[PDB]
Design an enzyme around this catalytic site. Sequence first.
Site, PDB file in Angstrom:
ATOM      1  N   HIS A  39       0.825  -1.205   0.000  1.00 38.72           N
ATOM      2  CA  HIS A  39       0.000   0.000   0.000  1.00 38.72           C
ATOM      3  C   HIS A  39       0.859   1.255   0.000  1.00 38.72           C
ATOM      4  O   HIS A  39       0.518   2.247  -0.648  1.00 38.72           O
ATOM      5  CB  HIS A  39      -0.937   0.001   1.206  1.00 38.72           C
ATOM      6  N   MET A 199       4.117  -8.981  -2.290  1.00 41.15           N
ATOM      7  CA  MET A 199       3.700  -8.465  -0.992  1.00 41.15           C
ATOM      8  C   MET A 199       2.248  -8.830  -0.713  1.00 41.15           C
ATOM      9  O   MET A 199       1.385  -8.686  -1.580  1.00 41.15           O
ATOM     10  CB  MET A 199       3.866  -6.946  -0.956  1.00 41.15           C
TER      11      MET A 199
END
Lengths: 306, 306
Positions: A39, A199
């Site tokens: 993010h 990720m």
Amino acid sequence: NTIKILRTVQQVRQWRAQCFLRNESVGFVPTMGALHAGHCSLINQSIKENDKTVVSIFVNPSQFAPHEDLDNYPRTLDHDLQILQTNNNNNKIVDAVFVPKVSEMYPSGISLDIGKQRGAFVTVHGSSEQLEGITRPQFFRGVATVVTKLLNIVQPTNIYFGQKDAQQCVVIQNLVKDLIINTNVRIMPTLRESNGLAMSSRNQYLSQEMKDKSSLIYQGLKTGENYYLNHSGDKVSANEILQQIKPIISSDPDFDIEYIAVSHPETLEDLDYVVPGTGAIVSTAVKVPKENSDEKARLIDNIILH
Amino acid sequence: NTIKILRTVQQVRQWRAQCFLRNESVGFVPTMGALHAGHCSLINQSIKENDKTVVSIFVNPSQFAPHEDLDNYPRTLDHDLQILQTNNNNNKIVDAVFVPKVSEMYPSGISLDIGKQRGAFVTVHGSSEQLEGITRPQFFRGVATVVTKLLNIVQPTNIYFGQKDAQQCVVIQNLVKDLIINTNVRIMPTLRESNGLAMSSRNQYLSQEMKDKSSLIYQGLKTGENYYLNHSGDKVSANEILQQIKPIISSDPDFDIEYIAVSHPETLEDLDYVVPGTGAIVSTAVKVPKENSDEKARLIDNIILH
């Protein structure tokens, strides 16, 4: 200087109206919380490209199915605020984070029981039923519906998504194309651990050997990518690309491959050949052991051919 | 000074971007062409309330069903431009008219065969299936889909609709509420002929006696309205209101009443009582003789209780 927490649509409208008055471009990173380095990669791109940046944190009920117990989805707002502050120490900043209640996002109510649902919903037909939509046929209607609402609240110049959810990115690109929305969809390359593992929220709680074992998936996909590159600018057999990947992800007997697909980047239909100038999305979903018992984690990853 | 004809999304974006730069409010009247005095009533309200006003003329394929021959829908652009110019002599003006091709509004294609449709579509569940949606179950999904696209192209401050299509107005109000769109939905009272007949495209081509005969419909509805008003601020039986209307529209043996409904103004569910402070939509659809043979025109009208 510090991050404004916006709780209501009207608060975001006021915040966005001040951006309008200031002639500021606005980047937008939508999330369901539980933030991680992936993010932050999106957020840092939004800050590079826009005068102002806003993040949303909303666990969207309409993408879940009734058999799923939505009540145990992890709420980690204080943790997420820390991520956003620590990333800001490493840079403009994240200006605002939007954390609405369900009732603000679904003013006519929401049920996981589709037969009980009421109000406006958006379906991107033709992008929602294959691949990840097979096990979750309700999912991308939920996603398209909530992203439409968020785009109408924030009205951003740019909206950011990670490539790892490749079908999701195609759904949003077609959403913005088909509803003719005045925003740029910015797809960022997947952020990876050192060993190449995409990720995810699982990462930070797995042993190093766990993450090292799972990096075989990307290693398989990379072999298919290197095959396609060597054959140039003539078309390359999609099935021959698949034959480079599958034996490598198969090298671990513990992995259960759900699919490996070679898909058109706009229609997601299966390709027989990958043509330079059009390319393909090469994606997979693989079940890997979790920690103990028979519970297994479902990992997805992909690589883009051009 | 004169009306700009905008053909493409990008032309509208440029036009709207200049309105943004000028800090001008923007009113929007969507139409399918074949303009009449009713449309001019909406347009004149938009001009009173906004710095700039734009009209769209687009026959939307997705609200039609496959058994309908969309190819004989009347195209009257030169006529419509005349309406817009003549109304402008009677006043700011209409600044722009947007007349797109199907391919601009449906970049992923469009079919009347729902099983062949592809791309983003919007359904306002719970507002789309009853009343007018019974004979046309595909209709309000088509309407909500195209109005969503138009709102995203024009990005108006205000969008204007006539009360005569009461269910359509509710669908759009719930669309804007549920997709959380930053526009005001402005519902204008129905414009009527002198004798009370709701304005329609049929009007101008019917004999005076034809229009005079059809004015009984509104006369029936007005009797139900006058009944509810006399009973005040206590609740009034919905069925007793219906008993004032039906005998009057029944007074002409040539009329075939399809329905008369007393409906909640937000959910469109049938009411047993009309409560002051909430009110009701009282609507009807009636088949009346056309000119000769057995062909009959389907007229709709309604009155709003408060």
